[PDB]
Short mmCIF file of C-alpha atoms (C1' of nucleotides) and ligand atoms in Angstrom, two decimals:
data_model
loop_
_atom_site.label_atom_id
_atom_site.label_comp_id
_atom_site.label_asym_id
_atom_site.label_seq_id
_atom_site.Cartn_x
_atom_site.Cartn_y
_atom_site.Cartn_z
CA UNK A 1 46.75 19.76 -17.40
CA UNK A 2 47.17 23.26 -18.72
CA UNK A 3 45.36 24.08 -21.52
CA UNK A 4 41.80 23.98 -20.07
CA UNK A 5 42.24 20.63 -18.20
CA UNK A 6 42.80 17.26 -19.71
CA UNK A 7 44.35 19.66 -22.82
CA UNK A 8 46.07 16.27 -23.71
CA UNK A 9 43.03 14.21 -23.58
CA UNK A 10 40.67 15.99 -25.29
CA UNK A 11 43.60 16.61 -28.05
CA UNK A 12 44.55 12.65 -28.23
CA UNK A 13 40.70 12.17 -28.28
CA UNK A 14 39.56 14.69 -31.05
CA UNK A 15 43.06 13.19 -33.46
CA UNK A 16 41.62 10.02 -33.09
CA UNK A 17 38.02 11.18 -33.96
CA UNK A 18 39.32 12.85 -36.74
CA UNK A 19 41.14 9.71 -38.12
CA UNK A 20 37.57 7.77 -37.91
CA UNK A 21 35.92 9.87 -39.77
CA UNK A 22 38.39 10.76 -42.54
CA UNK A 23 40.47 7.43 -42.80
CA UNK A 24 37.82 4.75 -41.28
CA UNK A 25 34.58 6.24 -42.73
CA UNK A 26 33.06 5.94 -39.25
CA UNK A 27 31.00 8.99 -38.66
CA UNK A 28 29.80 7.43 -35.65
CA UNK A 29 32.45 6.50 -34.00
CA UNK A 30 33.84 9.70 -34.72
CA UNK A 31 30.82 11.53 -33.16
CA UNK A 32 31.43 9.59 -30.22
CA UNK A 33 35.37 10.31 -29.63
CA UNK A 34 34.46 14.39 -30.13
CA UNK A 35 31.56 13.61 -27.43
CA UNK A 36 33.81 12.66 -25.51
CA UNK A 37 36.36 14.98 -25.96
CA UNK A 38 33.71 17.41 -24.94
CA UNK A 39 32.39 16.32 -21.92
CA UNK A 40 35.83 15.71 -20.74
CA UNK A 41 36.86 19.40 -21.86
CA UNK A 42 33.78 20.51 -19.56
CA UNK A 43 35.33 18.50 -16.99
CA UNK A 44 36.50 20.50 -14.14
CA UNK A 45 39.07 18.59 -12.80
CA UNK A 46 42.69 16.63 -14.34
CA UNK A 47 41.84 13.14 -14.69
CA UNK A 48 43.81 10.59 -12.98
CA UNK A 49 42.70 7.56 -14.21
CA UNK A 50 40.83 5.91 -17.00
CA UNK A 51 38.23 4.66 -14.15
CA UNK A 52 37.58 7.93 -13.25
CA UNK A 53 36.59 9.09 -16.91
CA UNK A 54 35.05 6.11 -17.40
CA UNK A 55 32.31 7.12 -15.12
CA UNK A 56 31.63 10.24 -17.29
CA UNK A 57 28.76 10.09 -20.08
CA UNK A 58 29.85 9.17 -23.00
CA UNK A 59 33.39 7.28 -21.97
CA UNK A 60 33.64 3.91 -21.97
CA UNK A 61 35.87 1.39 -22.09
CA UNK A 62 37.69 1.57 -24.96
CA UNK A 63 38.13 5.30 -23.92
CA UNK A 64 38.72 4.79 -20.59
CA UNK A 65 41.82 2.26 -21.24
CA UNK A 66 43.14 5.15 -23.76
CA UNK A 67 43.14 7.41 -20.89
CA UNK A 68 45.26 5.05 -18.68
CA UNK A 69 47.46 4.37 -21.50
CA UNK A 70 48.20 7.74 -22.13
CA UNK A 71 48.63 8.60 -18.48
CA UNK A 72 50.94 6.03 -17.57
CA UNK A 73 53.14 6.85 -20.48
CA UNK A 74 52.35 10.21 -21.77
CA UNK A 75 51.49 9.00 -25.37
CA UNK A 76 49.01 6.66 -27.44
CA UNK A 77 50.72 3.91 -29.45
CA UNK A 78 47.85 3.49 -31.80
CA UNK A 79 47.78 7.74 -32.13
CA UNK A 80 51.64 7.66 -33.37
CA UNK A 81 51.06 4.77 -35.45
CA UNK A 82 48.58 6.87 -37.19
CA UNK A 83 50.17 9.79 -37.09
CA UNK A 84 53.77 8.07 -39.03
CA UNK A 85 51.66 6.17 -41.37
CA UNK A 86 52.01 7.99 -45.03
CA UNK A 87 48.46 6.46 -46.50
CA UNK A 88 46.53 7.39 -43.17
CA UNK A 89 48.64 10.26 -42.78
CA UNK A 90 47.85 11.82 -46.24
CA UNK A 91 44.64 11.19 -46.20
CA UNK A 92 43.69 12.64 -42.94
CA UNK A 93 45.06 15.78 -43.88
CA UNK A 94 43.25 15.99 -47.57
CA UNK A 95 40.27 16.45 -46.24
CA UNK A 96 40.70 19.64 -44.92
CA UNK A 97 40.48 20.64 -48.56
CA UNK A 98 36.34 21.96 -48.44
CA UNK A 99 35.09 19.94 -50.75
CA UNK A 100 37.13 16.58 -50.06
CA UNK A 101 35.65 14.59 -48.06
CA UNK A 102 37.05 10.75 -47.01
CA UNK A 103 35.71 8.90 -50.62
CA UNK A 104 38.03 12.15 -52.77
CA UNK A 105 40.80 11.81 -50.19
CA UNK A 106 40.89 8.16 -50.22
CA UNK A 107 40.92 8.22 -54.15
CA UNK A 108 43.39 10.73 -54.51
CA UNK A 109 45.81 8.94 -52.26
CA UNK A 110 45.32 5.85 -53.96
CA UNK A 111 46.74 7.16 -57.48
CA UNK A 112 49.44 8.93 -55.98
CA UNK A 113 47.73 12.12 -55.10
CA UNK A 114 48.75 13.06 -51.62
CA UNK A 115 49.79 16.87 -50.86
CA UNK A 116 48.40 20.61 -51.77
CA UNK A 117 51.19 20.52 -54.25
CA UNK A 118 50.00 16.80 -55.56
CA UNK A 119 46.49 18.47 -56.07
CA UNK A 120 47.62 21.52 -57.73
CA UNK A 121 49.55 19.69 -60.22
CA UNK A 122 46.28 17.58 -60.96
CA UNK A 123 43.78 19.64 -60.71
CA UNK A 124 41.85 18.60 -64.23
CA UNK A 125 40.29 15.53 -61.34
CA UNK A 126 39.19 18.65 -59.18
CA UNK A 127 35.56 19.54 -58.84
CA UNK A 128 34.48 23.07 -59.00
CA UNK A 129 33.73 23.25 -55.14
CA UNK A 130 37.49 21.16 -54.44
CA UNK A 131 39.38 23.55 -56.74
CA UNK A 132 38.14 26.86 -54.50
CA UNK A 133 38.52 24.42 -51.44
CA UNK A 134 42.04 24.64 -52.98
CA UNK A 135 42.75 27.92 -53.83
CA UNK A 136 42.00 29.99 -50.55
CA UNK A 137 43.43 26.25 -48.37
CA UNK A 138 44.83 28.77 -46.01
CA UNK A 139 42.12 31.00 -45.82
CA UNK A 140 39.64 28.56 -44.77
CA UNK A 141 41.28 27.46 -41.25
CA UNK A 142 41.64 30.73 -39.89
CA UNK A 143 39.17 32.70 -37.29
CA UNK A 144 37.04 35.37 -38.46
CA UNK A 145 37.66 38.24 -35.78
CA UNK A 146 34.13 39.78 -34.79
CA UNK A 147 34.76 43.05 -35.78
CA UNK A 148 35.66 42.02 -39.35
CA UNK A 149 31.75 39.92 -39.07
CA UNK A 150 30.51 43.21 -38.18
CA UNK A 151 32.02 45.09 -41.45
CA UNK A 152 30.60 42.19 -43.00
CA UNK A 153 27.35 42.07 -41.37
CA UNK A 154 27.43 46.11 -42.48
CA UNK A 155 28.22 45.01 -46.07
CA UNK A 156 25.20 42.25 -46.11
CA UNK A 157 22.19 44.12 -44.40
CA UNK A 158 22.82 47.19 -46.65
CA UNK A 159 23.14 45.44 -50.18
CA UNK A 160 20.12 43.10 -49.00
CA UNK A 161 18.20 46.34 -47.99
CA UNK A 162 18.86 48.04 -51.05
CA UNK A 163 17.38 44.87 -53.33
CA UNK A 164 14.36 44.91 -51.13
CA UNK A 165 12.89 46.43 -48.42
CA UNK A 166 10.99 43.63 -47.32
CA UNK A 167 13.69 41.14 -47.11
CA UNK A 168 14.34 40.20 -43.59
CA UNK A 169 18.50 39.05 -43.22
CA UNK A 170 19.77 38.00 -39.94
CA UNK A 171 23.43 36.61 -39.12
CA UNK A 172 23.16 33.98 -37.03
CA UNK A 173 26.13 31.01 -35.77
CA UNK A 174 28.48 32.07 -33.50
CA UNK A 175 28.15 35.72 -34.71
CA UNK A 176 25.01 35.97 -32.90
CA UNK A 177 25.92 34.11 -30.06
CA UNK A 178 28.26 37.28 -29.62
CA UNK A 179 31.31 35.27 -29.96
CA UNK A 180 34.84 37.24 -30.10
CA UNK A 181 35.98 34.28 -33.33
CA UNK A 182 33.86 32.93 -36.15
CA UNK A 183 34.77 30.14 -38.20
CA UNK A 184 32.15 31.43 -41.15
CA UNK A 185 29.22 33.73 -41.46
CA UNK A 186 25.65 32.32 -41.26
CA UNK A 187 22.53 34.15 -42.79
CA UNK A 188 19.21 33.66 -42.84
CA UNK A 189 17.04 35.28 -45.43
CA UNK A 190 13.66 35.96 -45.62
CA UNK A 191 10.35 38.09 -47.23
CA UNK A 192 6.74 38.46 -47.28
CA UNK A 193 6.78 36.77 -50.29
CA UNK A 194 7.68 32.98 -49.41
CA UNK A 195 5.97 31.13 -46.87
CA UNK A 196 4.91 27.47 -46.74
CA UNK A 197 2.16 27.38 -48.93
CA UNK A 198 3.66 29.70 -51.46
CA UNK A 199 10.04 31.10 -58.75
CA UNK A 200 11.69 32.06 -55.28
CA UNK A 201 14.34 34.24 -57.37
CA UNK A 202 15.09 36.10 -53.99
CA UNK A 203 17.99 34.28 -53.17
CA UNK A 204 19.30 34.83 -56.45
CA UNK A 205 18.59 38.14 -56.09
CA UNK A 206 20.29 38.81 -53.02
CA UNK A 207 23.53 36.50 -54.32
CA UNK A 208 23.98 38.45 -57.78
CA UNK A 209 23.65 42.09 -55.92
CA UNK A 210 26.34 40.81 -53.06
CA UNK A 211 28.69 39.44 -56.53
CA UNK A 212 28.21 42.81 -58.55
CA UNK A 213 29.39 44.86 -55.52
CA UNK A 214 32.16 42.29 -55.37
CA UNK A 215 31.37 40.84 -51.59
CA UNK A 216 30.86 37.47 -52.85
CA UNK A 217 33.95 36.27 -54.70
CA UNK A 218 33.21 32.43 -55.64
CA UNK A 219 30.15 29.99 -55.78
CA UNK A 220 30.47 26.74 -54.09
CA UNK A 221 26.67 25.63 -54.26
CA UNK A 222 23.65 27.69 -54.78
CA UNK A 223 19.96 25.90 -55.30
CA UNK A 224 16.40 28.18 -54.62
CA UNK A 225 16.98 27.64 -50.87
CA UNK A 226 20.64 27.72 -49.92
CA UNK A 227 23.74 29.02 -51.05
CA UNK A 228 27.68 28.05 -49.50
CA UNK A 229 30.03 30.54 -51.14
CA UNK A 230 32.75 32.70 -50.48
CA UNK A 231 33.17 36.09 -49.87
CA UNK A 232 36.00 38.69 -48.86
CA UNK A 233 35.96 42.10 -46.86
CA UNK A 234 37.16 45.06 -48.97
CA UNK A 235 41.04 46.39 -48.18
CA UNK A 236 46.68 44.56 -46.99
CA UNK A 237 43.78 42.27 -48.65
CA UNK A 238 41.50 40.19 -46.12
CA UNK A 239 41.59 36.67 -46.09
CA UNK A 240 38.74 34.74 -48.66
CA UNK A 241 36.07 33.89 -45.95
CA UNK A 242 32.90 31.41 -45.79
CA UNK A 243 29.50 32.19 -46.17
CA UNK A 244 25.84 30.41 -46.24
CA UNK A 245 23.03 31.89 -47.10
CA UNK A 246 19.64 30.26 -46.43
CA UNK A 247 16.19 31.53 -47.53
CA UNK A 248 13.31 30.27 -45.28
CA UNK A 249 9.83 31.00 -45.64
CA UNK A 250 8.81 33.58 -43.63
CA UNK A 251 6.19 31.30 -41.32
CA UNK A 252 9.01 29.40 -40.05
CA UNK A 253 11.41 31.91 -39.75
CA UNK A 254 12.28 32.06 -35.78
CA UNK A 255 12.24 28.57 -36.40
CA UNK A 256 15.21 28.91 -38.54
CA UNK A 257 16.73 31.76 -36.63
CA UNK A 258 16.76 29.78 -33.35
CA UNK A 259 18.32 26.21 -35.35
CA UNK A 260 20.96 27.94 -36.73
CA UNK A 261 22.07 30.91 -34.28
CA UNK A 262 22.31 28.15 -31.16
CA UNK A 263 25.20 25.76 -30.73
CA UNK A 264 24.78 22.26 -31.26
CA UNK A 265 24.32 21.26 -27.77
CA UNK A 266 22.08 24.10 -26.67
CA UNK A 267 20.30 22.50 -30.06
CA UNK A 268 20.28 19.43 -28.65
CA UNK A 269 19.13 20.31 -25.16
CA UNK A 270 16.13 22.30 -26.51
CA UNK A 271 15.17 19.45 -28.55
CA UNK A 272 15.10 16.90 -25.29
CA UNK A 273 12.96 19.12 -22.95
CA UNK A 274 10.54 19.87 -25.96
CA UNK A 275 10.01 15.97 -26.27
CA UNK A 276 9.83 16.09 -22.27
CA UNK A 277 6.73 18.04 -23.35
CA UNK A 278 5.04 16.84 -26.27
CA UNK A 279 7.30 18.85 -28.73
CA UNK A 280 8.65 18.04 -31.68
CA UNK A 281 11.14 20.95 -32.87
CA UNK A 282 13.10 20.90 -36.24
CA UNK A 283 14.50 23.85 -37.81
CA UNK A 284 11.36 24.98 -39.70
CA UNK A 285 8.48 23.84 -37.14
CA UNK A 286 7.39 22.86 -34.00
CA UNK A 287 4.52 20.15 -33.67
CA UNK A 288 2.89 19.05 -31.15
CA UNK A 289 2.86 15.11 -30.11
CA UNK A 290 -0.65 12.93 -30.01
CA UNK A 291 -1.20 10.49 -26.82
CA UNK A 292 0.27 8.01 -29.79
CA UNK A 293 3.42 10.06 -30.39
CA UNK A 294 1.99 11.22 -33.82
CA UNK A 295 2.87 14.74 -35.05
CA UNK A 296 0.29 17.57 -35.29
CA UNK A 297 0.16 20.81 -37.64
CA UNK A 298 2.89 23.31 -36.90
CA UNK A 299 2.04 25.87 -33.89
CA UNK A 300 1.93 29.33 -34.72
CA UNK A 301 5.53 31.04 -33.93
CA UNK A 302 5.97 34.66 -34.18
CA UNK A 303 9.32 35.15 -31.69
CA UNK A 304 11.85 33.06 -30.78
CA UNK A 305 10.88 33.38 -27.28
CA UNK A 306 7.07 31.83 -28.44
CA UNK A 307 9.07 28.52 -28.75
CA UNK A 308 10.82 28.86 -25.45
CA UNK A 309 6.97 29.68 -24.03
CA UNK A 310 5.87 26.42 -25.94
CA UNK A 311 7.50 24.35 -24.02
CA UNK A 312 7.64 26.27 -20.97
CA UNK A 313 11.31 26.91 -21.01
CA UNK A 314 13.05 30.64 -19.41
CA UNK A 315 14.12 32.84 -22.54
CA UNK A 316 17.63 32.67 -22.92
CA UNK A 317 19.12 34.93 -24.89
CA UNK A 318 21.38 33.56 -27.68
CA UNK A 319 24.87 35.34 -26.01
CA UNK A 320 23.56 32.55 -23.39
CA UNK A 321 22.96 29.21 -25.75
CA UNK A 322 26.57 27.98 -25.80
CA UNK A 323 25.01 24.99 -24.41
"C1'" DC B 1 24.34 -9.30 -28.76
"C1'" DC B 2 23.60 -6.01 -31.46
"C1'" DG B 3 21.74 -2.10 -33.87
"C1'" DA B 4 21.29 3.14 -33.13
"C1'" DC B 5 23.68 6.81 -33.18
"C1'" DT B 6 19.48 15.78 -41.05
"C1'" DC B 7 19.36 18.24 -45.16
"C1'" DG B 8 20.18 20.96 -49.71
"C1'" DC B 9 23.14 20.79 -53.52
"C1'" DA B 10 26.67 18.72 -56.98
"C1'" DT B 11 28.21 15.00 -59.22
"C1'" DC B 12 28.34 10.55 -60.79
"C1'" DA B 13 26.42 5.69 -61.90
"C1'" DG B 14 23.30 3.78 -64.37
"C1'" DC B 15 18.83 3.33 -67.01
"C1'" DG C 1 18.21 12.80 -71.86
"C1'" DC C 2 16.53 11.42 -66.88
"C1'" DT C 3 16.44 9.32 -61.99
"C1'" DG C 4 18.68 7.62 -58.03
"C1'" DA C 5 22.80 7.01 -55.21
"C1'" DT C 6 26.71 8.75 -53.18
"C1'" DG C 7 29.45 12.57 -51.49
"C1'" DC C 8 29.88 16.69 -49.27
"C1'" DG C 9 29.70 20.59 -45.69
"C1'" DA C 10 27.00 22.03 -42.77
"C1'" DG D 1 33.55 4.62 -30.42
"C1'" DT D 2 29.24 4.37 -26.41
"C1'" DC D 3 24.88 3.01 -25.10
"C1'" DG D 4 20.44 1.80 -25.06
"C1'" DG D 5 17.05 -2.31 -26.18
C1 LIG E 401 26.57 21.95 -38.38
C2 LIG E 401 25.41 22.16 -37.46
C3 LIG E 401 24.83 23.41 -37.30
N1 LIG E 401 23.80 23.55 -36.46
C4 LIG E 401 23.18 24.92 -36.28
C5 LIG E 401 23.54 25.38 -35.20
C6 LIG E 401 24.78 26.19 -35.54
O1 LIG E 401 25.12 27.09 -34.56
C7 LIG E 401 24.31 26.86 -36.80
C8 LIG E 401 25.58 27.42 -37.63
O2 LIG E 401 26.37 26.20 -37.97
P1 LIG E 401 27.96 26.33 -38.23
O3 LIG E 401 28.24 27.57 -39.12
O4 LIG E 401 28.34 25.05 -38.97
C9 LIG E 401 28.89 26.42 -36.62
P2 LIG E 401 28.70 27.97 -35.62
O5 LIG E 401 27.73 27.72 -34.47
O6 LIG E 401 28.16 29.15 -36.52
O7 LIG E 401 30.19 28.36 -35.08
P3 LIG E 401 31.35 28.71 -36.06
O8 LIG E 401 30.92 28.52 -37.43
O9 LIG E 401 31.74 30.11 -35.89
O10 LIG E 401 32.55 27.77 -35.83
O11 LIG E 401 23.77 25.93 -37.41
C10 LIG E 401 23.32 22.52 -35.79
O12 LIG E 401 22.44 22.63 -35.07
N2 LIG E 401 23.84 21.34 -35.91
C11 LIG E 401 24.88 21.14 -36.74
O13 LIG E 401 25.36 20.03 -36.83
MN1 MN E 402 28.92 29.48 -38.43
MN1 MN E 403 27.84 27.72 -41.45
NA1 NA E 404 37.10 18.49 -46.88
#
DNA sequence: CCGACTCGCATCAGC
DNA sequence: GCTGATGCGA
DNA sequence: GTCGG
């Protein structure tokens, strides 16, 4: 009970969400080990028992007996099962190639296919997105330091600027939450051209200028309304980074802004209290709900702080939405 | 006991 | 060819 | 996996 507290639990607990998901093919299942992980991470004391985590949300008792297992011996038997066994082993760790998920990993172990090297020899049964996934492997897991996602905010604002004017560009995820590490950069796009009722060609637009001043290095997916791609600060060269770029018409753009700057739980807790008062928020919109529960026509939003008003919620400023 | 627990894009199965 | 299903990362 | 209905 270092790390944080309960450093070992939440550790044995996220491994064995991880295996769920990638070797089992149980999203849910995993979603409920990294739960728990969490709340036991926000825990502020070292648990002594499985009955004491039991009574947290979200640990039961499969969970809870885990716990006691691992405290009375310092180690999971089912975890270092896992972790020995070559199949589950291999393909656990394929999927932290982007683009292969448990079905590709799964596959490729079957015929044989089991390390970077494995895939690199093979990659004629690589997808576009899985060979890129490949080629910057290492580039992918690490941190973005904020002050390179402010060069690269600089780089994005000004080529976006220079296309048009009116396009409105905003980095949102963790960036905007004013965290010191970002895993990718997040950025919402918008102009007075595109709203609900409205060829979008501004995403394009906004893509090919960021490629011809050689910021974006590498396409993973690109349709009229998102794009995942990669891109890569100009130099000692920086490591190949990821970036998504969403266009979102501009009526339901605080909308947007507010889904993807805030974490997942703040998300989440937003979402509750506006049901608590006859809201129903998605990304885009928020609706009222009839006496019946039936959805109206989206509510005119024209800050983020009007949706915070909607449902009579204290603005909190995104540095503030961790949770 | 037992079912519950989003979306845009790429690719593939199949018609 | 096209449509729908499945996979994927977010 | 946990947690309701
Ligand atoms: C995946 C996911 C995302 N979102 C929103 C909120 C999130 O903040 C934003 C950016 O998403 P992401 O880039 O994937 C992680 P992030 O917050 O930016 O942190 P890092 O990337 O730096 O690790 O989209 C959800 O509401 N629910 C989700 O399930
Ligand atoms: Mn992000
Ligand atoms: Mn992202
Ligand atoms: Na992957």
């Amino acid at each position: 009970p270092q790390e944080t507290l309960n450093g070992g639990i939440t550790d044995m607990l996220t491994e064995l969400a991880n295996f769920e998901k990638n070797v089992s093919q149980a999203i849910h299942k995993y979603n409920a080990y990294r739960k728990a992980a969490s709340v036991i991470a926000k825990y502020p004391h070292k648990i002594k028992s499985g009955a004491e985590a039991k009574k947290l949300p979200g640990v039961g008792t499969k969970i809870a007996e885990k716990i006691d297992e691992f405290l009375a011996t310092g180690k999971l038997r089912k975890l270092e099962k896992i972790r020995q066994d070559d199949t589950s082993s291999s393909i656990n760790f394929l999927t932290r190639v982007s683009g292969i998920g448990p079905s590709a990993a799964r596959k490729f172990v079957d015929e044989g296919i089991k390390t970077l090297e494995d895939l690199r020899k093979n990659e004629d049964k690589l997808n576009h997105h899985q060979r890129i996934g490949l080629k910057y492997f290492g580039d992918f897991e690490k941190r973005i330091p904020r002050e390179e996602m402010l060069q690269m905010q600089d780089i994005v604002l000004n080529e976006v600027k220079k296309v048009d004017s009116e396009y409105i560009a905003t980095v949102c995820g963790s960036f905007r939450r004013g965290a010191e590490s970002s895993g990718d950069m997040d950025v919402l796009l918008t102009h007075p051209s595109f709203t609900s009722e409205s060829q979008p060609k501004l995403l394009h637009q906004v893509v090919e200028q960021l490629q011809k001043v050689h910021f974006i290095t590498d396409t993973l997916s690109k349709g009229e309304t998102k794009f995942m791609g990669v891109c890569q600060l100009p130099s000692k060269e920086y490591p190949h980074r990821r970036i998504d770029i969403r266009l979102i018409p501009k009526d339901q753009y605080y909308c947007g802004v507010l889904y993807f700057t805030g974490s997942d739980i703040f998300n989440k807790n937003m979402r509750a209290h506006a049901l608590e008062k006859g809201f129903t928020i998605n990304e885009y919109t928020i609706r009222p709900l009839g006496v019946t529960g039936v959805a109206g026509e989206p509510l005119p939003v024209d800050s983020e702080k009007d949706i915070f008003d909607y449902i009579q919620w204290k603005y909190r400023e995104p540095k503030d939405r961790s949770e």
